[PDB]
Amino acid sequence: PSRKFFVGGNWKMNGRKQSLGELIGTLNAAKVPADTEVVCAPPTAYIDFARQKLDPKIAVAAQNCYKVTNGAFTGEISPGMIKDCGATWVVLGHSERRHVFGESDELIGQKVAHALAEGLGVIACIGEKLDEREAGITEKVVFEQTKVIADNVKDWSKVVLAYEPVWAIGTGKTATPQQAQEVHEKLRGWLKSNVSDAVAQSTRIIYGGSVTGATCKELASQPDVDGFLVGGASLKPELVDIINAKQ
Amino acid sequence: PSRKFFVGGNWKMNGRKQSLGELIGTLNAAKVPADTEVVCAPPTAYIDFARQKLDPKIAVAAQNCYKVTNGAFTGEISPGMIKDCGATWVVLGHSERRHVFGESDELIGQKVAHALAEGLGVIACIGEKLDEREAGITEKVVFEQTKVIADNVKDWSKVVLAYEPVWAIGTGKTATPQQAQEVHEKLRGWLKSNVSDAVAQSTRIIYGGSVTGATCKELASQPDVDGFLVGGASLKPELVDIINAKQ
C-alpha cells in the first residue's frame, strides 16, 4: 500500500497578502497530480487568509504552535486556534526554531503530543548540523530527535517526518540523492525497530534543504524519500514542478 | 497638553473565532470615552480576523514580532505583515516573552527599532520579578530595561511604556495605587533626565498586572499612571469598565 507523495511549502517569514495571494492563485490554477498531498505553511498572521484563498485541494499548516490549549503565552498560538482557522497541520521542530529560537527536544515533544491530541497533523522536523555530521554523529543526532518525537506519537497516521540537514537549509547545497536516501533508509529502519513494521512502511519521510526544480526528480526517485519540505522554492512557480516530481 | 488615557487588552493565547467574535461585539457596542485610546492584541492567528470585526474606534496590536522585514524565520512575523493586516501596534518585551521564551533586552531593543522604522506603534513592556522586588532592586531593573528601549527610540510619539511587575501578572496581586505611582513617577523621572522634559511629559506610562474593574479607578487616579495593559480582564465585558476608568 504505497505511501502518498507529500510536498509542503514553508513560506517562513515571507510575503504579504498581495504576493501570497498571487502565489495561491498559481496553486489554485495548477493541476495537482494523483496521489499527491500538498500543504502550504504561511506566516502565522496569514493562516486564516491562506485557508480562505486556497482551493480545498491544498491544505494549510501553521509554522509553529505551543503546547496547551489556551493560556498566558503572549505571542503564541494553540493547536485549537490553528484548527479553528481551517488549517490541518503544524510544522514542529523546524531547524530555525531549534537553533535560532532555542526550542529543546523536550519542548518539541510536548508540542507534538498536544497538537496530535487536539486533532492536528504534525510535520515533525529533524536534522543534523554540519559539525555533527563532520564528527560522525549524524545518525545518533537524528535518531535521538526522532525518538523524542516518537515518545509523543500514539498514532502515526497523522505524522510526517521531515529530514532537513541544517547545512542544506537555505544554503543552495541540496543533499545528493545518495545522502538523502542513506538517511531516510536509516530513519525508516529506526521506525521498524522501535515502533512497528506497519509504521515504518506507512510513514512518509520527506526531505528538505534546498529542494529545487533541478534536484527534485532524482531525489523523489529514491525509494525511502517520500516527498519534500520546500522553503525558498515554495515562493516561486517552481513549486509546481516540485509538486510534479514523480510525473 | 495632557496625556491621552490608554487601554490595551492583551488576549494572550486565548479565544477562538466564536468567543472572540462575541467579545468584539461587546466592544463595538461599548462606549469608548473622550480622549481614550483603546487597543486590542489578539492571538497572532487572529490579527486579521479581529481587525475585520472590530470597529475602527479600536486599534489592533500584534502580541510580538521579529526584527527584520522578511527572512528565514519559521514561526515569526514582521512589522510589515502586521501593518498589512491593518494592525497599527505591536507589544514588545512582554513578561512572558522575556521570562518564558528567553527574549533578551538586546533582542527587544532590536525589535523596537525595527517596528518603529516600519511605522508601527510599540507598547514596550518592562517590569521586575518577584525576587528583584524582594531584593529591593526594582528601580535598577526597570531603569536598565527602559534604557535599552530608549536607546532604540528616535521618536517617542508612537511608543507607550508598560510597567507590569511580574508578580502582579495573572496572580490577582494587583499593585496598589501607591506602588504603581511610585514606579511610574521614577520612570517619568528617568525619561526627563535621560531623554527630555518634553518626552517625560508626553509619553504614556501604563500599568499592568491584575488590573480589574474593582482596582482600575484608583489606579487611573494616580498622576503618573496613564492607563492599563489588561490581560485576564480583557477577555470579559469587565474590560469596558476599565476603558471607562476615569469616567
Coordinates of C-alpha atoms in Angstrom, one line a residue:
Chain A
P1 CA 0.0 0.0 0.0
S2 CA 2.1 2.9 -1.5
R3 CA 3.0 6.0 0.6
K4 CA 1.3 9.1 -0.8
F5 CA 3.9 11.7 -2.2
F6 CA 3.8 14.8 0.1
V7 CA 5.0 18.3 -0.7
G8 CA 4.9 21.0 1.9
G9 CA 5.8 24.7 1.1
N10 CA 7.3 26.5 4.1
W11 CA 6.9 30.2 3.3
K12 CA 8.7 31.1 6.5
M13 CA 8.6 34.8 7.4
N14 CA 7.9 36.0 3.8
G15 CA 5.1 37.5 1.9
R16 CA 2.2 39.9 2.1
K17 CA -1.4 39.5 1.1
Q18 CA -0.7 40.7 -2.4
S19 CA 2.3 38.5 -3.2
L20 CA 1.0 35.5 -1.3
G21 CA -2.4 35.8 -2.9
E22 CA -0.7 35.6 -6.2
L23 CA 1.2 32.5 -5.2
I24 CA -2.1 31.0 -4.1
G25 CA -3.7 31.8 -7.3
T26 CA -0.9 29.9 -9.1
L27 CA -1.5 26.8 -7.0
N28 CA -5.3 27.1 -7.4
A29 CA -4.9 27.1 -11.2
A30 CA -2.4 24.3 -11.2
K31 CA -3.4 20.7 -11.8
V32 CA -2.3 18.8 -8.6
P33 CA -1.5 15.3 -9.6
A34 CA -2.8 12.0 -8.4
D35 CA -1.8 10.5 -5.1
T36 CA 0.0 13.8 -4.2
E37 CA -0.7 15.7 -0.9
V38 CA 0.1 19.4 -1.0
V39 CA 0.3 21.6 2.1
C40 CA 1.2 25.3 2.4
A41 CA 2.6 26.8 5.6
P42 CA 2.2 30.6 5.7
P43 CA 3.4 33.1 8.2
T44 CA 1.2 32.9 11.2
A45 CA -0.6 36.2 10.5
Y46 CA -1.8 34.7 7.2
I47 CA -3.0 31.2 8.3
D48 CA -6.7 32.4 8.0
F49 CA -6.1 34.4 4.8
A50 CA -4.3 31.4 3.2
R51 CA -7.0 29.0 4.0
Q52 CA -9.7 31.5 2.8
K53 CA -7.9 31.9 -0.5
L54 CA -6.6 28.4 -1.2
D55 CA -8.7 25.7 -3.0
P56 CA -9.6 22.9 -0.6
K57 CA -7.3 20.5 -2.6
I58 CA -4.3 22.3 -0.8
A59 CA -4.1 22.0 3.0
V60 CA -2.8 24.7 5.3
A61 CA -0.2 24.3 8.1
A62 CA 0.9 26.5 10.9
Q63 CA 4.7 27.1 11.1
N64 CA 4.7 26.5 14.9
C65 CA 2.4 26.3 17.9
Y66 CA 2.5 26.0 21.7
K67 CA 1.8 23.1 24.0
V68 CA -1.5 23.9 25.8
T69 CA -5.0 24.8 24.5
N70 CA -5.1 28.3 26.0
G71 CA -3.1 30.3 28.5
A72 CA -0.9 33.3 29.4
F73 CA 1.5 33.0 26.5
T74 CA 1.7 36.3 24.7
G75 CA 2.8 35.8 21.1
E76 CA 1.9 32.1 20.9
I77 CA -1.0 30.2 19.3
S78 CA -2.5 26.9 20.1
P79 CA -3.5 23.8 18.0
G80 CA -7.1 24.7 18.6
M81 CA -6.7 28.1 17.0
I82 CA -5.0 26.5 14.0
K83 CA -7.9 24.1 13.5
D84 CA -10.3 26.9 14.1
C85 CA -8.8 28.7 11.1
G86 CA -9.3 25.6 9.0
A87 CA -5.7 24.5 8.9
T88 CA -4.9 20.8 9.4
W89 CA -1.2 20.7 10.0
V90 CA 1.5 22.2 12.1
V91 CA 5.3 22.2 11.5
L92 CA 7.1 21.3 14.7
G93 CA 10.9 21.3 15.5
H94 CA 11.9 23.2 12.4
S95 CA 15.7 23.9 12.3
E96 CA 15.1 27.7 12.8
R97 CA 13.0 27.0 15.9
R98 CA 15.7 24.7 17.4
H99 CA 18.8 26.6 16.5
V100 CA 17.7 30.3 16.2
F101 CA 14.9 30.3 18.9
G102 CA 16.4 27.6 21.2
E103 CA 13.4 25.2 21.2
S104 CA 14.5 22.0 23.1
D105 CA 13.7 18.4 22.1
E106 CA 11.7 18.2 25.3
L107 CA 9.5 21.3 24.3
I108 CA 9.2 19.9 20.8
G109 CA 8.0 16.6 22.2
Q110 CA 5.4 18.3 24.3
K111 CA 4.1 20.3 21.3
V112 CA 3.8 17.1 19.3
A113 CA 1.8 15.4 21.9
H114 CA -0.6 18.3 22.4
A115 CA -1.0 19.0 18.6
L116 CA -1.9 15.3 18.0
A117 CA -4.3 15.2 21.0
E118 CA -6.1 18.1 19.5
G119 CA -6.5 16.5 16.1
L120 CA -3.9 18.3 14.0
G121 CA -1.4 16.6 11.7
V122 CA 2.3 17.2 12.5
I123 CA 5.2 17.7 10.2
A124 CA 7.9 16.8 12.6
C125 CA 11.4 18.1 11.7
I126 CA 14.7 16.6 12.4
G127 CA 18.3 17.0 11.2
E128 CA 22.0 17.3 11.9
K129 CA 24.3 20.3 11.9
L130 CA 27.3 20.3 9.5
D131 CA 29.7 19.9 12.6
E132 CA 27.7 16.9 13.9
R133 CA 28.0 15.3 10.5
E134 CA 31.7 16.0 10.5
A135 CA 32.1 14.5 13.9
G136 CA 30.5 11.2 12.7
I137 CA 27.3 11.6 14.7
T138 CA 24.5 12.2 12.0
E139 CA 22.6 9.0 12.9
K140 CA 22.9 9.4 16.6
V141 CA 21.6 13.0 16.3
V142 CA 18.6 12.2 14.1
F143 CA 17.7 9.0 16.0
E144 CA 17.6 10.9 19.3
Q145 CA 15.4 13.7 17.7
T146 CA 13.2 11.1 16.2
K147 CA 13.0 9.2 19.5
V148 CA 11.7 12.2 21.4
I149 CA 9.1 12.7 18.6
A150 CA 8.1 9.0 18.8
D151 CA 7.8 9.1 22.6
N152 CA 5.0 11.7 21.9
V153 CA 3.2 9.9 19.0
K154 CA 0.5 7.4 19.6
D155 CA -1.0 7.4 16.1
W156 CA 1.5 7.8 13.2
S157 CA -1.3 8.2 10.7
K158 CA -1.3 11.9 11.3
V159 CA 2.5 12.4 11.2
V160 CA 5.0 13.1 8.5
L161 CA 8.8 13.1 9.4
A162 CA 10.9 15.7 7.6
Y163 CA 14.6 15.2 7.5
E164 CA 16.4 18.5 6.8
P165 CA 20.2 18.6 7.2
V166 CA 20.9 22.0 8.7
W167 CA 23.7 22.7 6.2
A168 CA 21.2 22.2 3.3
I169 CA 18.6 24.7 4.6
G170 CA 18.8 28.0 2.6
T171 CA 22.4 27.5 1.5
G172 CA 21.8 26.2 -2.0
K173 CA 23.6 23.0 -1.1
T174 CA 21.0 20.3 -1.6
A175 CA 21.7 16.8 -0.3
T176 CA 22.5 14.5 -3.1
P177 CA 20.1 11.7 -3.8
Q178 CA 22.6 9.3 -2.1
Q179 CA 23.0 11.4 1.0
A180 CA 19.2 11.8 1.4
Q181 CA 18.4 8.1 0.7
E182 CA 21.1 6.9 3.2
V183 CA 19.5 8.9 6.0
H184 CA 15.9 8.2 5.1
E185 CA 16.6 4.4 4.9
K186 CA 18.2 4.6 8.4
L187 CA 15.2 6.5 9.7
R188 CA 12.7 4.0 8.4
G189 CA 14.8 1.2 9.9
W190 CA 14.6 3.1 13.2
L191 CA 10.8 3.2 12.9
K192 CA 10.8 -0.6 12.1
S193 CA 13.0 -1.4 15.1
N194 CA 11.3 0.9 17.6
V195 CA 7.7 1.2 16.7
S196 CA 6.4 -1.4 14.1
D197 CA 6.8 -2.6 10.5
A198 CA 3.5 -1.2 9.6
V199 CA 4.5 2.3 10.9
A200 CA 7.9 2.1 9.1
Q201 CA 6.1 1.2 5.8
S202 CA 3.3 3.7 6.0
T203 CA 5.0 6.8 7.5
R204 CA 6.1 9.5 4.9
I205 CA 9.7 10.6 5.5
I206 CA 10.2 13.8 3.4
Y207 CA 13.5 15.6 2.6
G208 CA 14.1 19.3 2.8
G209 CA 17.1 21.7 2.4
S210 CA 17.4 23.5 -0.9
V211 CA 14.9 21.4 -2.9
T212 CA 14.6 22.9 -6.3
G213 CA 13.1 22.0 -9.7
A214 CA 16.5 20.9 -10.8
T215 CA 17.0 18.5 -7.9
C216 CA 13.6 17.2 -7.2
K217 CA 13.1 14.3 -9.7
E218 CA 16.2 12.4 -8.7
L219 CA 15.6 12.9 -5.0
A220 CA 11.9 11.8 -5.4
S221 CA 13.1 8.6 -7.2
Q222 CA 14.9 7.4 -4.0
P223 CA 12.8 4.6 -2.5
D224 CA 12.8 6.0 1.1
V225 CA 12.3 9.7 0.1
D226 CA 8.6 10.3 0.1
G227 CA 8.3 14.0 -0.6
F228 CA 9.7 17.4 0.3
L229 CA 9.6 20.3 2.7
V230 CA 10.3 23.2 0.4
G231 CA 11.5 26.7 1.6
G232 CA 12.9 29.1 -0.9
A233 CA 11.5 27.4 -4.0
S234 CA 8.0 27.4 -2.4
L235 CA 7.8 31.2 -3.0
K236 CA 8.4 30.7 -6.8
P237 CA 6.2 29.0 -9.6
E238 CA 9.0 26.3 -9.4
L239 CA 7.0 24.9 -6.6
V240 CA 4.6 23.4 -9.2
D241 CA 7.5 21.5 -10.8
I242 CA 8.4 20.1 -7.3
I243 CA 4.8 19.0 -6.8
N244 CA 5.1 17.1 -10.1
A245 CA 8.5 15.5 -9.2
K246 CA 7.2 12.0 -9.7
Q247 CA 5.4 12.7 -13.1
Chain B
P1 CA -1.3 69.0 26.6
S2 CA -2.4 66.2 28.9
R3 CA -1.6 62.6 28.0
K4 CA -4.4 60.7 26.4
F5 CA -5.6 57.7 28.6
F6 CA -4.6 54.4 27.0
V7 CA -6.0 50.9 27.5
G8 CA -4.5 47.8 25.8
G9 CA -6.3 44.4 26.0
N10 CA -3.8 41.6 25.7
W11 CA -5.8 38.5 24.9
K12 CA -2.7 36.4 25.1
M13 CA -3.2 32.8 23.9
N14 CA -6.9 32.7 24.4
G15 CA -10.0 32.6 22.3
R16 CA -11.4 31.3 19.0
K17 CA -13.4 33.0 16.2
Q18 CA -16.7 32.3 18.1
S19 CA -15.7 33.6 21.5
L20 CA -13.5 36.5 20.2
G21 CA -16.3 37.5 17.8
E22 CA -18.6 37.7 20.8
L23 CA -16.1 39.8 22.7
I24 CA -15.6 42.1 19.7
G25 CA -19.4 42.5 19.5
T26 CA -19.4 43.7 23.1
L27 CA -16.6 46.1 22.4
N28 CA -18.3 47.5 19.3
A29 CA -21.4 48.1 21.4
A30 CA -19.5 49.8 24.2
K31 CA -18.9 53.4 25.0
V32 CA -15.2 54.5 24.4
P33 CA -14.9 57.8 26.0
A34 CA -13.4 61.0 25.3
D35 CA -9.7 61.1 24.8
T36 CA -9.3 57.4 25.4
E37 CA -7.2 55.3 23.1
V38 CA -8.1 51.6 23.1
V39 CA -6.0 48.8 21.5
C40 CA -6.8 45.0 21.5
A41 CA -4.0 42.5 21.0
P42 CA -5.3 39.2 19.7
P43 CA -3.5 35.9 19.2
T44 CA -1.4 36.1 16.1
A45 CA -3.6 33.8 14.1
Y46 CA -6.5 36.3 14.6
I47 CA -4.9 39.7 14.0
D48 CA -6.6 39.8 10.6
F49 CA -9.9 38.4 11.9
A50 CA -10.0 40.9 14.8
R51 CA -9.2 43.9 12.6
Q52 CA -12.0 42.9 10.2
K53 CA -14.6 42.6 13.0
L54 CA -13.6 45.4 15.3
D55 CA -14.9 48.9 14.7
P56 CA -12.2 51.5 13.7
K57 CA -12.6 53.1 17.1
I58 CA -10.4 50.2 18.5
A59 CA -6.9 49.7 17.1
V60 CA -5.3 46.2 16.8
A61 CA -1.9 45.2 18.1
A62 CA 0.2 42.1 17.4
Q63 CA 1.4 40.4 20.6
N64 CA 5.0 40.2 19.3
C65 CA 7.1 40.4 16.1
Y66 CA 10.6 39.8 14.8
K67 CA 13.4 42.2 13.9
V68 CA 13.7 42.1 10.1
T69 CA 11.2 42.6 7.2
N70 CA 11.4 39.1 5.8
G71 CA 13.5 36.1 6.1
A72 CA 14.2 32.5 7.1
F73 CA 12.4 32.7 10.5
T74 CA 9.8 29.9 10.6
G75 CA 7.1 30.8 13.1
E76 CA 7.8 34.6 13.2
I77 CA 6.0 37.6 11.8
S78 CA 7.3 41.0 10.8
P79 CA 6.1 44.6 11.3
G80 CA 5.3 44.7 7.6
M81 CA 2.9 41.7 7.9
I82 CA 1.3 43.3 11.0
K83 CA 0.7 46.6 9.1
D84 CA -0.6 44.6 6.1
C85 CA -3.3 43.0 8.3
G86 CA -4.4 46.6 9.3
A87 CA -2.9 46.5 12.8
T88 CA -1.1 49.6 14.0
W89 CA 0.7 48.5 17.2
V90 CA 3.0 45.7 18.4
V91 CA 3.5 44.6 22.0
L92 CA 7.3 44.0 22.7
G93 CA 9.1 42.7 25.7
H94 CA 6.1 41.3 27.3
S95 CA 6.9 39.5 30.6
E96 CA 6.1 36.1 29.1
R97 CA 8.4 36.7 26.1
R98 CA 11.3 37.6 28.4
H99 CA 10.8 35.1 31.1
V100 CA 9.1 32.0 29.5
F101 CA 10.6 32.5 26.0
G102 CA 14.0 33.9 26.8
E103 CA 13.9 37.1 24.9
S104 CA 16.8 39.2 25.8
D105 CA 16.9 43.0 26.3
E106 CA 19.2 43.1 23.3
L107 CA 16.7 41.4 21.1
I108 CA 13.8 43.5 22.4
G109 CA 15.7 46.7 21.6
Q110 CA 16.3 45.4 18.0
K111 CA 12.6 44.7 17.6
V112 CA 11.6 48.1 18.9
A113 CA 13.9 49.9 16.4
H114 CA 12.7 47.8 13.6
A115 CA 9.0 48.1 14.4
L116 CA 9.2 51.9 14.8
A117 CA 11.2 52.2 11.5
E118 CA 8.4 50.2 9.8
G119 CA 5.7 52.7 11.0
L120 CA 4.1 50.6 13.8
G121 CA 3.4 51.9 17.3
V122 CA 5.0 50.0 20.1
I123 CA 3.8 49.0 23.6
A124 CA 7.1 48.4 25.2
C125 CA 6.9 46.4 28.3
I126 CA 9.2 46.4 31.4
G127 CA 9.0 45.0 34.9
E128 CA 10.8 43.3 37.8
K129 CA 10.5 39.8 39.0
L130 CA 9.2 38.9 42.4
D131 CA 12.8 38.2 43.6
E132 CA 14.0 41.6 42.3
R133 CA 11.2 43.4 44.1
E134 CA 12.0 41.4 47.3
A135 CA 15.8 42.2 47.0
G136 CA 15.0 45.9 46.7
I137 CA 16.4 46.3 43.1
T138 CA 13.1 47.2 41.2
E139 CA 14.4 50.6 40.2
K140 CA 17.7 49.3 38.9
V141 CA 15.9 46.6 36.8
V142 CA 13.3 48.8 35.3
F143 CA 15.7 51.6 34.5
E144 CA 18.1 49.3 32.8
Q145 CA 15.2 47.8 30.7
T146 CA 13.9 51.3 29.9
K147 CA 17.4 52.4 28.8
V148 CA 17.6 49.6 26.2
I149 CA 14.3 50.6 24.9
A150 CA 15.1 54.3 24.9
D151 CA 18.4 53.6 23.0
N152 CA 16.3 52.2 20.2
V153 CA 13.7 55.0 20.1
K154 CA 14.3 58.1 18.0
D155 CA 10.7 59.3 18.2
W156 CA 8.6 58.6 21.3
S157 CA 5.3 59.8 19.5
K158 CA 4.3 56.2 18.8
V159 CA 5.7 54.5 21.9
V160 CA 3.8 53.6 25.1
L161 CA 5.7 52.2 28.1
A162 CA 4.0 49.5 30.1
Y163 CA 5.2 48.7 33.6
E164 CA 4.0 45.2 34.6
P165 CA 5.6 43.8 37.7
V166 CA 6.0 40.1 37.1
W167 CA 4.5 39.3 40.5
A168 CA 1.2 41.0 39.5
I169 CA 0.7 39.3 36.2
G170 CA -2.1 36.8 36.3
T171 CA -1.7 36.4 40.1
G172 CA -4.5 38.6 41.3
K173 CA -1.9 40.6 43.2
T174 CA -2.6 44.0 41.7
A175 CA 0.0 46.6 42.6
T176 CA -1.5 49.1 45.0
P177 CA -2.1 52.6 43.6
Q178 CA 0.9 53.7 45.7
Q179 CA 3.2 51.0 44.4
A180 CA 2.3 51.8 40.8
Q181 CA 2.5 55.5 41.2
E182 CA 5.9 55.1 42.9
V183 CA 7.4 53.2 40.0
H184 CA 5.7 55.3 37.3
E185 CA 6.9 58.6 38.8
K186 CA 10.5 57.2 38.8
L187 CA 10.2 56.1 35.2
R188 CA 8.9 59.5 34.1
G189 CA 11.9 61.0 36.1
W190 CA 14.2 58.7 34.1
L191 CA 12.8 59.9 30.9
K192 CA 13.2 63.6 32.0
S193 CA 16.9 63.2 33.0
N194 CA 17.8 60.9 30.0
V195 CA 15.7 62.0 27.1
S196 CA 13.9 65.4 27.7
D197 CA 11.2 67.1 29.8
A198 CA 9.0 67.0 26.7
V199 CA 9.3 63.3 26.3
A200 CA 8.7 62.8 30.0
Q201 CA 5.5 64.9 29.9
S202 CA 4.0 63.4 26.7
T203 CA 4.9 59.7 27.0
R204 CA 2.2 57.4 28.3
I205 CA 3.3 55.1 31.1
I206 CA 0.6 52.4 31.6
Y207 CA 0.3 49.8 34.4
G208 CA -0.4 46.2 34.0
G209 CA -0.8 43.2 36.4
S210 CA -4.2 42.1 37.6
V211 CA -6.0 45.2 36.6
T212 CA -9.7 44.7 37.3
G213 CA -12.9 46.7 37.4
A214 CA -12.5 46.9 41.2
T215 CA -9.0 48.3 41.0
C216 CA -8.9 50.5 37.9
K217 CA -10.4 53.8 39.2
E218 CA -8.0 54.3 42.0
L219 CA -5.0 53.3 39.8
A220 CA -6.1 55.6 37.0
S221 CA -6.4 58.5 39.6
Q222 CA -2.7 58.4 40.2
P223 CA -1.0 61.3 38.4
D224 CA 1.8 59.2 36.7
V225 CA -0.4 56.3 35.6
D226 CA -1.8 56.9 32.2
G227 CA -3.7 53.8 31.5
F228 CA -3.5 50.0 31.5
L229 CA -2.3 46.8 29.9
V230 CA -5.1 44.3 30.7
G231 CA -4.7 40.5 30.5
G232 CA -7.3 38.4 32.2
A233 CA -10.0 41.1 32.4
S234 CA -9.6 42.0 28.7
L235 CA -11.4 38.7 27.8
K236 CA -14.5 39.8 29.6
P237 CA -17.1 42.7 29.4
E238 CA -15.2 44.0 32.5
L239 CA -12.8 45.5 30.0
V240 CA -15.4 48.2 29.3
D241 CA -15.3 49.4 33.0
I242 CA -11.5 49.6 32.8
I243 CA -11.8 51.6 29.4
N244 CA -14.1 53.9 31.4
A245 CA -11.9 54.1 34.5
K246 CA -11.7 57.9 34.6
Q247 CA -15.4 58.5 34.0

